[PDB]
Design an enzyme around this catalytic site. Sequence first.
Site, PDB file in Angstrom:
ATOM      1  N   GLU A  65      -3.839 -10.006   7.336  1.00 52.73           N
ATOM      2  CA  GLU A  65      -4.734  -9.650   6.236  1.00 52.73           C
ATOM      3  C   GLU A  65      -5.678  -8.524   6.630  1.00 52.73           C
ATOM      4  OE1 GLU A  65      -5.138 -10.774   3.042  1.00 52.73           O
ATOM      5  OE2 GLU A  65      -4.474 -12.859   2.891  1.00 52.73           O
ATOM      6  N   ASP A  66      -5.080  -7.395   7.008  1.00 51.34           N
ATOM      7  CA  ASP A  66      -5.787  -6.181   7.414  1.00 51.34           C
ATOM      8  C   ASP A  66      -6.676  -6.426   8.630  1.00 51.34           C
ATOM      9  OD1 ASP A  66      -4.850  -4.026   6.015  1.00 51.34           O
ATOM     10  OD2 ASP A  66      -6.250  -4.259   4.345  1.00 51.34           O
ATOM     11  N   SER A  67      -6.056  -6.836   9.721  1.00 50.95           N
ATOM     12  CA  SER A  67      -6.747  -6.899  10.993  1.00 50.95           C
ATOM     13  C   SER A  67      -5.948  -6.162  12.043  1.00 50.95           C
ATOM     14  CB  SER A  67      -6.982  -8.324  11.469  1.00 50.95           C
ATOM     15  OG  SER A  67      -7.846  -8.977  10.602  1.00 50.95           O
ATOM     16  N   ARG A  87       0.804  -1.212   0.000  1.00 48.58           N
ATOM     17  CA  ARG A  87       0.000   0.000   0.000  1.00 48.58           C
ATOM     18  C   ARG A  87       0.838   1.263   0.000  1.00 48.58           C
ATOM     19  NH1 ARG A  87      -4.423  -3.235   1.291  1.00 48.58           N
ATOM     20  NH2 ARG A  87      -3.852  -4.524   3.092  1.00 48.58           N
TER      21      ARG A  87
END
Lengths: 350, 78, 576, 40, 115, 159, 48, 139, 238, 179
Positions: free
Chosen positions: J153-155, I39
Amino acid sequence: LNGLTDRDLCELNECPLDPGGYFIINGSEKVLIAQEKMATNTVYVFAKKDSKYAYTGECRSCLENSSRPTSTIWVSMLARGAIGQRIVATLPYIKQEVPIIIVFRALGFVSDRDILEHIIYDFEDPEMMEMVKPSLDEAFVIQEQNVALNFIGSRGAKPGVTKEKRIKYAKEVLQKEMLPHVGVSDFCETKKAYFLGYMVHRLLLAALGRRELDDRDHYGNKRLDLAGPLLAFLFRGMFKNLLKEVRIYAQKFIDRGKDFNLELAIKTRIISDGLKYSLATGNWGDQKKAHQARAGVSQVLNRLTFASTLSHLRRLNSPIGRDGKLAKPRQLHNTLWGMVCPAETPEGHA
Amino acid sequence: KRITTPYMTKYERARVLGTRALQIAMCAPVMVELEGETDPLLIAMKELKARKIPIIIRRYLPDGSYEDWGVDELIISD
Amino acid sequence: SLKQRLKGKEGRVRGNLMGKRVDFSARTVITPDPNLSIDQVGVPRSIAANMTFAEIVTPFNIDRLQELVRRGNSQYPGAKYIIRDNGDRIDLRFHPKPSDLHLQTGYKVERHMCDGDIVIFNRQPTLHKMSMMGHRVRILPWSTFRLNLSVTTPYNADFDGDEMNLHLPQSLETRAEIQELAMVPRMIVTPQSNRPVMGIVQDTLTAVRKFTKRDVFLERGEVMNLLMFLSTWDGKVPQPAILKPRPLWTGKQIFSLIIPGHINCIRTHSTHPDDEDSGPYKHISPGDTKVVVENGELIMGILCKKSLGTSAGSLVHISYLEMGHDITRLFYSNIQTVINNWLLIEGHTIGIGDSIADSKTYQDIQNTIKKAKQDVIEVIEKAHNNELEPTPGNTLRQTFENQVNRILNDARDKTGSSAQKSLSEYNNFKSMVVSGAKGSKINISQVIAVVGQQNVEGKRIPFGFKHRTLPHFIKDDYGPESRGFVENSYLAGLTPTEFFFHAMGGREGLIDTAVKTAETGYIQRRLIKSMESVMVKYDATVRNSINQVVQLRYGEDGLAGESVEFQNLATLKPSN
Amino acid sequence: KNVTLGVPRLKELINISKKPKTPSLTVFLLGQSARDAERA
Amino acid sequence: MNAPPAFESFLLFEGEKKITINKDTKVPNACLFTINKEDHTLGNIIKSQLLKDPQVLFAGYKVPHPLEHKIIIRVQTTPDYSPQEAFTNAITDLISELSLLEERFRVAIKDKQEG
Amino acid sequence: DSACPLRTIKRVQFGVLSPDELKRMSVTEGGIKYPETTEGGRPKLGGLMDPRQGVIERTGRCQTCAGNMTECPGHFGHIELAKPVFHVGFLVKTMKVLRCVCFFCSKLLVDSNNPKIKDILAKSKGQPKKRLTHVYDLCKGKNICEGGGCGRYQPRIRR
Amino acid sequence: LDSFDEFIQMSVQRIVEDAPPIDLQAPPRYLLKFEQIYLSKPTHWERD
Amino acid sequence: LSEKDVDPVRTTSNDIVEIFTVLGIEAVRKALERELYHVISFDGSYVNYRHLALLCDTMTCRGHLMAITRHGVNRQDTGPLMKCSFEETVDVLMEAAAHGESDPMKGVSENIMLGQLAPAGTGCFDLLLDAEKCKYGME
Amino acid sequence: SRHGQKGTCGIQYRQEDMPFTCEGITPDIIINPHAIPSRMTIGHLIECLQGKVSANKGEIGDATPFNDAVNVQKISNLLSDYGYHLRGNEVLYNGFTGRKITSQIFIGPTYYQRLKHMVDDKIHSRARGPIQILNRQPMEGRSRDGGLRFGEMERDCQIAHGAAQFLRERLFEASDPYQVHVCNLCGIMAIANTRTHTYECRGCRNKTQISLVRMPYACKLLFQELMSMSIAPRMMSV
Amino acid sequence: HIDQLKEREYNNYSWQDLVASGVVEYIDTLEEETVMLAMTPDDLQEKEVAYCSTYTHCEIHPSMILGVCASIIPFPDHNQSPRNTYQSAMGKQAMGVYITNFHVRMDTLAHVLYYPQKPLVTTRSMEYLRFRELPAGINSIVAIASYTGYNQEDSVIMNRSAVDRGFFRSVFYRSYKEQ
RNA sequence: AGGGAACCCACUA
DNA sequence: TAGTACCTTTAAGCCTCAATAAAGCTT
DNA sequence: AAGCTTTATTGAGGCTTAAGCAGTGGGTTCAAGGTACTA
Ligand SMILES: [Mg+2]
Ligand SMILES: [Zn+2]
Ligand SMILES: [Zn+2]
Ligand SMILES: [Zn+2]
């Protein structure tokens, strides 16, 4: 709450940090999202692609105070695929095209030197002469103003069989409905001819390569309808309906040979619930034309954060369809610098 | 005379196990000696490994005819 | 009208017959759970106490189902209905008269969904058949569905707010066929590309690259703690790789214990030199970059995405083909548990220090950018002074843009490679890149060296004003700054014009995402409806619904796509 | 050469388009007319 | 909505058994001590005090799931010693160590408070 | 419970509903005659909310069958139209037939024994729609009934 | 705020003034012309 | 292809219809496979050949080029219930009613519509109870 | 965070389970390292560093976009002036075992936002409940105890699985099971009086050749909407 | 001008007196296409090689190109631009105190954070968005670490003790009405 | 022990 | 006389016209 | 003779049909005003 201090706002159970800018419609806070549109009264020359027209110079013309329905005039050139390349016009309320020299003869100038003086400002470049010659060629048979006006009127919306009715109808179309920002009164045919020759001249320049074509998405070519113009667009139609119902009431009360009560003649609910309906639903028009009108003009003010409220009060809208698959209106244009946030945009269909 | 594959396909295995499990859950006589077993799926699997499921698979050829294979006649992959 | 009722995606056929709302379905947010097996889904207690499975009463389960009926709908491990043979439903939420709680053989008890129940678990968009797999219910406290981390790759899921759907099969037949056809271990290898769909991902991948390096030495207590999380462990502590001065185990020994059976696989690490395999140290690797798993033991080599990922011939693929779905499921779970618990010792971060190069590298980067900008100015001066001759096929504008873009792309590539050479072996950006877990080398380059050239519809930044990209440049400026070459890194931050040009470039990906999701879905639907009835028949031909022969054998060879592998023909290439 | 690829080309493939966006050939030349550029 | 009460971290519900021994037959002389309503606080000290024992061949603990409150300790001993005896000895040594620590801490507090 | 044998569908045969069949299977024997749905508190017979056409109330029963709102599948009424009109979904098919048959004697414009007709019933025997397409392409260029039959000039049907 | 102030201060009056006066006949004429507008402060009317 | 010093063997096109009208249906099947392979594998991805082969065989099964549209799928000998499930539902059912088409219920969407077991995987055979094998089971 | 780094809470550990610094500072939030590289939210790391400097200094940091007075090296030198590592890393200790973590962990004050998307506003399950009045399928949405749409792509995937019976219970049994009676001759839906066992077909005038047919309710609705178009969808059960 | 704008209350000198001084002026997009802008007054001092010596305008501050929701992003020029877009989308979904008279309003949905904090790292444009007065968020001590695998995973792993102390606690308001 | 439909808008992945 | 109930966005296919040309009929 | 006349190809215009999946939530309006007529 205008001009109140913070203490006075807190006395009224109002927030001093609240910016305003919205309407309370039936207890719902409604914000008018600004709608972008092409700028009126500006000549834009585009290249219509894969079409019979090589170039098209349009001018969405609006009276700038009266604000009738914006009457666009197109002045196009035909594509090469004829002994030359030919300039035609697309007048409002004339369902067929008219070649441009017939329009110039209908405006009063019969000679070719006068018309080309209104189109070509320096006679010393013959390259621009070579492009106007076919338009002079198919207007050879038309050499007089009433003959040109008959040519206009025989292609109108309802061509009356009387010749003078066609003449008067054509004169009304070329006075009130062709380029009304130039002027709608009498004795305005020279200014209308000068502006129409300017449109033809811009089309010739763009076709000669001498001027670059106009950008749809250049943001100086756009205007934004805020709460003012949107509410005035509503109020014109609703005041027109108010005067219509006053004339209907008074006509019904003079066919009976009586007198009418004018304070009882006014249907005050035409303006009231019309404005209330359009601000409450967001459909920008009448109740019976909900599909015809555009929605999302008035939205419920988002009150989840102060930043979401402030963002909602400064939101713009390109009304181009959200199912459109062309990338160009969704591009971040160069001309958005300092005017529109380059980062803030939704994700998804918009 | 039977031209179809001698192996049991995975779709056949799934449907034979489901059908037999439902039959056992409807109190069909178990064919094998269950040892403290209660769940009909495990009993059906134990019958399938023992090659004892009393079910005939009728495989339809595209021309319209069929072949009857017993479960005990097919090679058990999983 | 009736036609409007029957047409469209919302009409009767497409919206109510091909697809419809279903009972016995649940939906909530998904959160990770490294402690679940790949075929388990963690289910909230409220979802399970609301979703019921109709269990037929036998003499085997008369007592268990009697207790479930006695507990009722209030207590969670309980029941909601009794369905008699005649078909009436005794609702257990009204706590009815105790004559109703009698259970005969043949009754159905709609007990609450409990542990070990089979569910279909699904994420939209359902693109391929591993987007809808079978899972065993495990009941966990809080309010989210919980997934393993290897499972998020077939679902294309993450945990930034995704919600997934849980369908409970209601029959024994359908529960059995989900168990035998659609469970997660059976869905490991896809027929689409004869490789696994699910591999070791994220933390476990970064830490298994860190774990299997040559200098990773584990002490006695650390080894015993890691062996606690090995489910397939036989209880025998292996002999340590080093016995004196102190007993130390390497990470390769513990991973050899994780590796199941006697898998035989050879891979190479991501950082394997191209000239090593031809060198003298072909089998004695100085960088530990050649992976050899022999008799299920990691002899040598650092593991990465090339070995434990979703590639063909990788370690999880070889494990699947040689050992079966259950052994490979245990392999996935054991890798994740052991490696995740070693990462408590080792740790893994990323900071602002990992994005920073040395001053020598910064000077080299600035020199490369300066020399490239000077080359672009020289090309501009050649084009102004008519020296620029077109290459064949292109005019002066495509050749000038090609020359400038070649200079600037060579700038970005050269200075990105200069940035990447500066990265130490302690760098965390490099840790995640060379393991394949997250990020690429262009990300390292943009963060450290230079963001590069911003492109709108393939070309550079267009002249959106009259012959200017912005009103801060002069007219007809074709230099790198004017047309969207971002000169800074993300660390150094962008100038205002570079910020706007980068926003113009980044808007393209957003637009492309929206329009591609609009159009590709229609393409996929048309692909489905053209071939939905094509299938392999019992004479092994492939026919459509009309019984018209599409293929006389499937794939012209008669094989299924899951079991086939990339191999090499020995006799094709060599000379006579 | 600027031939189309990606999802537009797949759409032009499965929808049998009589007018693909970038139709083209790859002409191969026989013998000595392919060895040198002058006869090509 | 599905929030467990804060007291199931440490309170045995009625019928839950604090510690169970399971003699796993996979390897000789090993046990699996499943301790309910405990966490890393006791698992780690018991594991390390077991690792000090020279007659203990394996000692490790695990929390199978952090959303459950359960410790599994696996102890393997030399055959002339038992995992139950190892566990009891480890707890006695931990208790004696903490008693000594408490008494020396009281002595040190009393010395510094006076001076 | 139903006593009928439970068995599946091996074939769904499509066709146009005959007006004789609509009149024969209807439960509204006189036909729908009144636009109103309720005659006060009662649903009007021959009205749109016909009581024989299904179950009005959630707690009531049907009158044709005795089933409640769940068991009742609903039953078809009918309107006998004063003047025959065009089915809008069948317009194009009516025009395809109209250019294929004679406007006056309603004979097929081409022969039933024609060799072109013979081999297009040969090559399109099992395909009715393509058979109509071929007969239509044969009859599109014609302008007059040949004959046995009349010889009147035939119009062009324009919609 | 400024766009609305323009509408309510300039545009409403301009809409009212730039409207055709209505003539009623057929018989005597009846001419109605609209002059300046007045916007009051926001008031609410009770049920009384 | 007709030119002198042009290879009439290897010279090809990416126009699918041009290859079909010049070279035939097996040639356009191979060309379609090549073009789909080029589109798929330019990204670097890989799809197994049997899926491409099945799509190309489906597109070129009936001798002409069957587009993946309503103009190729809804012009087959499939049933009206299969065609109406894809596109042009009311038009397909009008055409089926007018010509008396009979839907033989042999597809997947047809049986999905009517709630039956689709002849697909698990539902592509019948199971029979074996009475002789039932004699060994204890109650 | 303020850098597009969204994510649900995966677990909550107590303070004694959290990793801690040498001065006992446990993080309020632990985010994954893998959220950063693909990102390239480097402003997130600069904000953590600047927030550490701000919290130690007592200032409020300036993060106005285009500023030459603030770069990462100046923030680093300020941070090292407060007895910290200049790049914002710290030696964290394992909360469970107490051991030092081998890697040094980037930790600092970062502005997090709680988003309105909560899980208790989103958790939904159905077993059996309200059904739509027209097609007798489960209702629309979690606010009315509705079911989830087993849509067309899910149907297509279950076709690809070969799971024909699961597809049958999803699209027939778990949505709208229904029974009609058909005349074996005309194929139109018959009239069935279940209590008096009087099955008849008007039009054919038979009373014995009637067959029970299990079809979805939405299919019966489709056929009755086809019969309104004067189509006879004759279900021939023979 | 600056010394006289430092005293807007003591002096009654404001923005309109700065417009009337001929010092600032409004430039629309068509006029912007004929102007020559300096980004900063740095662009006006003479260079050894001069880009333009014919500047006609200067930017006031170049961070006024961002709107309300992108002005709250700290260091947005160090972020990849889709992430700035996503934060502009997600700053509108952030929970804070949306207005100060929320106790009077019967909004259908309302979300009030218990303890909103102003950011420790601020942009200078958030003095005009009133984000210091109505903030939406809490300054969290945030470690970037792989801990136990629950932040993958985006936690996010959160401190339960902090949450017990009121960290990110909030109150939800639902309003119902009947006539 | 469960009496709404339609449209619009915003949003989620 | 006041009052209440009722009257009335674009992209690709297919189909269908006007316009032609060998070829047989009639000079 | 060379003119006349008839049935199969072309090119442009008109009609039709399609345009991702799955989720939340709110908000509005449907169903509305003149009337013709009485106890
Ligand atoms: Mg996601
Ligand atoms: Zn009935
Ligand atoms: Zn006739
Ligand atoms: Zn019948």
